[PDB]
């Protein structure tokens, strides 16, 4: 077909034009801008708590907005809300499907969400209407496994699925209000902007897309990774984000410059990144790895600052408290560790 | 600070209740063998078992089995297959009557090879079901389809001396069966160390002994892992 041939020709011409436009803005690199900045030094965090009680491996955790409570999901079919200060378990929610792959805590603290190989995102009412915790709403639109979910607020949640789509939900109606399409592979993670007006998603096509929540369209597409992107997180400023992929590298992309700023990799690292997160100031990039450690990276320089080596199996999730007080890591050894 | 002490006491009581429930949950979890039923759409696994994932529970010799069949998922598996690293066994169902009808047998071989060599699945055993034995037998007896057309090594392949065939079986049917089985076992033994094992099984889509085969294979897997914990094997 000549129509398909000329459409592909136009697409590659547009890609070349975009590449030229991005190249013209690369007057200098971030590495040489922050060359005179003093190094962060050596970061040595100790394990302060070890949360035990999960029977199987843990895929997801999410810190509460109060920086004290967190929720974790394990393949045994359990959601546990922990009191990280006292290591006491607050709730232990049995799941209808044991193949959970993600969990989200609501910013208000009234709800938790989970999903997985069953394509349903389940919302749980934490606050005691009568005393117990039960399923509040099930969202069954997706045709693939649920990989990530994040509450915009109460009654709004964004979910990424293996059907290569992201969706925006209304909890009371249970219906999708917006569908975000354009990824050609499984969407593995999403991160909400601080203002909750935009969110980025990393997929198995080695691409990250910046979406508009209100308009439901892809504003920008970021490339540069070589394998499936497993993790994504905004810089605390909101004008940048970091990704972690199976190609054993972490990359920092700038929204306004519309390109890559820095790559975080070492020759001794040949395993993929499963989770990334920033510190409170964004100076440190924390990445979990297929090998059982976590690496602390300088954000403004491409040099490692410290290592979190406490886990006996794959590190599957990590997160930093809203106040930056501590970082928690989940792992396939069925333990959560609080680092400080 | 008495209010703080009361809150701590209440939190401790709630934690104690949660741990007491978790003990029973752990006891239930350890006494159940989870199984991942995997195969092609026309491999016959739909009759064998007779929503993102389907679930069926069957009890054999008072032992609980929990077998999961993957439903509404895309054909890309490299991400959600990692959820079954700690499963007791992966039941792989292959249509033996597909060496020509789209080389489906080669696709099944590639899928098995990918499962075998995956880093997160390098400790999970595979119960292999070479299904549709009657259809393969009738196709071999008919002679219309030649296996050597799509597997050139079949011409120079001889039935193994340890092969035990059924009484009323054509030697050609037995040779084809064991050729497919050895095609799978070549991948199984190429890099399959003592961590995980393969259990070939010439089965029909409707066999009353399939649950017995699964039970025996799971018992063997558990016994082997126990013996390896003691470094006896």
């Amino acid at each position: 077909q000549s129509e398909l041939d000329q459409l592909r020709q136009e697409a590659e011409q547009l890609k070349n034009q975009i590449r030229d436009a991005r190249k013209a803005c690369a007057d200098a690199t971030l590495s040489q801008i922050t060359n005179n900045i003093d190094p962060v030094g050596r970061i040595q965090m100790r394990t302060r708590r070890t949360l035990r009680g999960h029977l199987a491996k843990i895929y997801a955790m999410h810190w509460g907005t109060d920086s004290r409570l967190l929720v974790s999901a394990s393949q045994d079919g359990k959601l546990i809300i922990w009191d990280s200060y006292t290591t006491n378990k607050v709730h232990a929610i049995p799941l209808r499907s044991s193949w959970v792959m993600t969990c989200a805590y609501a910013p208000s603290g009234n709800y938790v969400a989970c999903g997985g190989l069953d394509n349903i995102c389940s919302i749980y009412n934490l606050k005691t209407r009568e005393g117990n915790v039960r399923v509040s709403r099930e969202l069954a639109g997706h045709t693939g496994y649920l990989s990530c979910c994040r509450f915009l607020d109460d009654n709004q949640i964004v979910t990424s699925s293996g059907d290569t789509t992201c969706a925006l939900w209304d909890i009371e109606t249970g219906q999708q209000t917006t569908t975000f399409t354009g990824h050609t592979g499984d969407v593995m993670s999403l991160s909400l902007a601080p203002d909750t007006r935009l969110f980025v998603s990393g997929a198995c096509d080695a691409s990250a897309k910046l979406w508009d929540v209100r308009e439901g369209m892809c504003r920008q597409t970021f490339t540069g990774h070589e394998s499936d992107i497993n993790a994504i997180c905004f810089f605390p400023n909101g004008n940048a984000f970091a990704t972690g992929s199976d190609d054993a590298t972490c990359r920092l992309f700038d929204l306004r410059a519309d390109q890559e700023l820095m790559t975080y990799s070492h020759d001794n690292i040949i395993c993929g990144i499963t989770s990334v997160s920033f510190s409170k100031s964004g100076r440190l990039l924390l990445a979990g790895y297929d090998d059982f450690n976590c690496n602390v990276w300088d954000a403004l320089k491409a040099d490692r600052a410290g290592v979190l080596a406490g886990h006996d199996n794959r590190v599957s999730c990590l997160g930093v408290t809203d106040d930056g007080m501590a970082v928690a890591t989940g792992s396939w050894d069925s333990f959560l560790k609080i680092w400080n | 600070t008495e209010d703080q002490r009361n809150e701590e006491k209440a939190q401790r009581e709630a934690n104690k209740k949660i741990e007491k429930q978790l003990q029973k949950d752990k006891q239930v979890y350890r006494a159940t063998h989870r199984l991942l039923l995997l195969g092609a759409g026309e491999s016959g696994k739909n009759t064998i078992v007779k929503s993102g994932i389907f679930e069926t529970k069957f009890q054999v010799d008072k032992v609980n089995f929990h077998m999961f069949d993957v439903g509404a998922q895309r054909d890309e598996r490299r991400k959600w297959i990692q959820c079954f690293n700690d499963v007791t066994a992966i039941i792989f169902v292959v249509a033996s009557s597909s060496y020509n009808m789209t080389n489906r047998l080669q696709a099944a071989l590639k899928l098995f090879d990918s499962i075998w060599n995956n880093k997160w699945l390098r400790d999970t055993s595979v119960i292999l079901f070479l299904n549709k034995q009657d259809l393969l037998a009738e196709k071999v007896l008919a002679g219309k389809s030649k296996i050597e057309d799509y597997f050139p090594e079949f011409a120079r392949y001889t039935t193994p001396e340890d092969a035990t065939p059924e009484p009323g079986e054509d030697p050609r049917v037995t040779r084809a069966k064991y050729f497919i089985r050895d095609e799978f076992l070549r991948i199984s033994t190429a890099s399959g160390d003592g961590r995980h094992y393969c259990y070939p099984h010439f089965t029909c889509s409707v066999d009353t002994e399939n649950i017995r085969r699964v039970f025996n294979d799971c018992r063997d897997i558990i016994q082997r892992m126990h013996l390896r914990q003691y470094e006896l094997l």
Partner: nanobody
Amino acid sequence: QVQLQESGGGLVQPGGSLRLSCAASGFTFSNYKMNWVRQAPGKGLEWVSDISQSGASISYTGSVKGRFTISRDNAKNTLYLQMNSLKPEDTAVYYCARCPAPFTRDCFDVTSTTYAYRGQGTQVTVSS
């Protein structure tokens, strides 16, 4: 941007010879295992051949064994497929597909209907 452009296909007589090349960019070529996948008209994607990172481990499908020769050049970031004895059943669109992850031995989803890390394809037609 991971790009794979394959060129070399075209009309060829039965028993003829064709050479398929695959120019790769956007990733470290030497770290990945390459594959060749074809789609016959009216049928699904069928795996053909693969070659390891160093090129010391080569596998073929039975239909083309002894006829096709896969080869890779890590310095030039190029993947090759030599065709020697073409048949009318060899008429298909041939795709240059890359394994999802580096340094791995398993190669999942390489023949998926909508699978990234695969080229647009080059048409090979065998007729008279």
